[PDB]
Structure 1
Amino acid sequence: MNLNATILGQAIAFVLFVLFAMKYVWPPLMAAIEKRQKEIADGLASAERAHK
């Protein structure tokens, strides 16, 4: 339809949501999974030595 300065404003609206995510959402959520995965892996290590 019509180009509008809205195209510029949406660039402002966009970037911030990237940074707030990058800092305050993604790493904290990756840790939540990976720590549980580590616990299950060391569980397997214990299972190994348990019979060894």
Structure 2
Amino acid sequence: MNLNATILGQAIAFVLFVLFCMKYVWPPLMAAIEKRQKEIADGLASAERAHK
């Protein structure tokens, strides 16, 4: 049998695997990061005004 078909198979699969990840998995990562990052911004705002 030919094996060269494995190059097309594994290339196409890995692209589509990234498409699912980027559109559904990177957003929750970045959003839990943004949600965590906000605590420093609130903490600095509340500490600045309350030192003032």
How high is the TM-score relative to the length of structure 1? 0.82
For structure 1, the residue ranges without an aligned partner over 5 or more in a row are none
Superposed CA deviations along residues 3-45 of structure 1, whole A, max 9, x for unmatched, are 6110011122111111011111101110001111112211111
Q: Distance in 2 between matches of 1:31 and 1:20?
A: 17
For structure 2, the residue ranges without an aligned partner over 5 or more in a row are none
Q: Following TM superposition, where does structure 1 have runs of at least 4 consecutive aligned residues deviating by more than 2 angstroms?
A: none
| Structural mapping, 1:1-52, within 5 Å | 4-52=4-52
Provide the aligned C-alpha RMSD in A: 2.4
Q: Distance in 2 between matches of 1:36 and 1:2?
A: 51
Give the Å deviation of 1:2: 8.8
> Could you tell me the percent identity over the aligned residues?
98
Q: Distance in 2 between matches of 1:32 and 1:2?
A: 46
Count matched residues. 52
Q: Distance in 2 between matches of 1:31 and 1:4?
A: 41
